[PDB]
């Protein structure tokens, strides 16, 4: 039912777990997760993935 050749790039997942997730919760917000303690201001900052 989801055989998309080249990958269906519509199914997502939070690769970078910012913190622990409360049961049944759902977060929908895109923001660069800084790993070098620097102001991302977008994606320009270092380690802002």
């Amino acid at each position, epitope marked *: *039912l*989801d*055989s*998309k*050749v080249g990958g*269906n790039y*519509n199914y997502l997942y939070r690769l970078f777990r910012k913190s622990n997730l409360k049961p049944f919760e759902r977060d929908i917000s895109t923001e660069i997760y800084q790993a070098g303690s620097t102001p991302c201001n977008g994606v320009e900052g270092f380690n802002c993935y």
Partner: antibody
Amino acid sequence: EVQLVQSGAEVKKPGESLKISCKGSGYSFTSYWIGWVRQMPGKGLEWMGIIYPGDSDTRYSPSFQGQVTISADKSISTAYLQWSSLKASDTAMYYCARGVAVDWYFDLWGRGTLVTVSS
Amino acid sequence: VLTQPPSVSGAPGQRVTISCTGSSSNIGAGYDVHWYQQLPGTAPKLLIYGNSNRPSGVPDRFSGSKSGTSASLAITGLQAEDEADYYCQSYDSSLSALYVFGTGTKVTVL
């Protein structure tokens, strides 16, 4: 080449079977949604079902359940259309076209079977 | 299930939007819309899919778009080969059926 060929024109009576070979090539057969679509003469396209050669998984249609027979042969990578009993009004063209999961469209269509069936 | 104008007329060199007006589960639900070029006397040929993508062999004069609950196929510079029939179709979650096809839009060149 990627081509889905059909059978020739046939005239016959309701009740008997009509077998159609729609050979598939140029793509991984067990990885694409192969299916049949029917069109009445001078009308629109109506969906019958799509079958997956990996598991013979068939999702038929509300208005076309219990009326037609579908199957596939992954041994020869050919799609099979069969009928347990035809009808006089069943004179219409049937197309075997391969779709893809997600976005659910036929990327390629077969030539189609022009079949005339009457009493 | 997808209603469409039975006959759409277009002069050569004119741009017309083939209105794919649908319900709240076929177009308005955010689902993607696809078009097939039912050339008369033959089998339909894929012309627009994904509302923005164009397959190999489709000229750029062919185009597609989505407008809320309706979709439009923009065709620019109608020629003799453009006399063809179009079925917009999409996916319906509520009817269980993977595939739902439009009523159709016969296109004639004036």
